[PDB]
Symmetry: C5
Subunit: 98 residues, 5 copies
Amino acid sequence: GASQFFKDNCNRITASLVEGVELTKYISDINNNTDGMYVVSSTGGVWRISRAKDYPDNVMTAEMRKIAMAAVLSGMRVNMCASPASSPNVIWAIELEA
Amino acid sequence: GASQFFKDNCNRITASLVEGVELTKYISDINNNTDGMYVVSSTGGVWRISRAKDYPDNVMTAEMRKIAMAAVLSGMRVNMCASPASSPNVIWAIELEA
Amino acid sequence: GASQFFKDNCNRITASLVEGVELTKYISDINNNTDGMYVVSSTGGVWRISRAKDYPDNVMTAEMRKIAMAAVLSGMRVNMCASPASSPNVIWAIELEA
Amino acid sequence: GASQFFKDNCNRITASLVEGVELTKYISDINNNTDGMYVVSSTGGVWRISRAKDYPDNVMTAEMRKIAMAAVLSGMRVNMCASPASSPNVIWAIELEA
Amino acid sequence: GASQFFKDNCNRITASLVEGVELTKYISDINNNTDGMYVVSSTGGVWRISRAKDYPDNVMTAEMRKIAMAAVLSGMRVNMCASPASSPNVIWAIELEA
Ligand code: NA
Ligand code: NA
């Protein structure tokens, strides 16, 4: 049950809408090769959270990390818009649902 | 119900007062043409949260994001003072109520 | 009740001590004329939270906002040292109590 | 009680190990000549939390603030390596305990 | 247990995967010899959280510290990828598990 606004914003062949995901793992990694921020779902799916140096994307990425860590802490579900082209798929948008 | 203070400030300007809103979705988006931070109400109404690069407004915008996210986690209601100029309407002021 | 330390530091020449305040609203506002961060108590008293652009005061002002929002979320009471020279009165020190 | 590691790092005559402290107030002050962040224990003990502009102490001092806040909100105890003179004392290290 | 993703990435013979660690202390230290951020587990094992002055690694190390603090606050277990060459061992990746 992603909002219709969230669905409308991720409605293209080059992006994957994924709905009602339970995230159960939140990962920070600064190892070589695998550095980044990730989440893993109850199913075992993995996404990478985008990072960005400057404004405005640095506001949105910081909020993606807060959404991700709140979902893992609370068990709230998220809906995601993600790039299918990248492995793990990179999150382009995320929706935290009560 | 909105504080008299908050109602008076919103009544100064042409923006519209919205009371007792229950926010159920919080969105961060870095897609190409819908980038931003947004909230979705229990009735499906959508608003964008103000963005600002610089001081002092970036203080207030950061707190609007925290108020948004707290309302979504807690189910606390919010009152908004929202501009109709844009789609979705932009939150110019918000009040978290316990 | 306010700590002796908090009370001793609130210089009565320049400010007044307010004890055992229950804050029930937290407001962020970016409108042109009512610009700022505020709190509203259970009795309708309003106060403006101080902001600063530079270190070190912006460490303290960030923590005033965290105390304010935590009090509204939790119902924990605060004590304030507030200047009466503006309306709303401005908070120059705040003490969150467990 | 304090970890052996924490005790080991605070084992000198000029700083005191203080264990099982209940913090019940958390103060932000920007007033003339008392500005700073402080905590008050259940028995009336006062400490200033250190402040630092630059890396790496800006990381640790920000974490000391979050530890103090969390202790006040949760009632979790802390252990401190602190100065041994009259209140208010300074803090060299702080351990939040579950 | 560790996600398959997490386990796959802790793949240097010089590194150690530790699973299902319950962290019970979170330390901020600004002493001269021992400055840093640490966690202590329910069995007394100690680790140092990595630090980084600059983007991008400072995004991940900030999230390491949020993961550690959340774990101590909630009792949620963590999985770590850590380096034995050090005393205390240094965390190069960490997975918070709901
Ligand atoms: Na006075
Ligand atoms: Na000592």
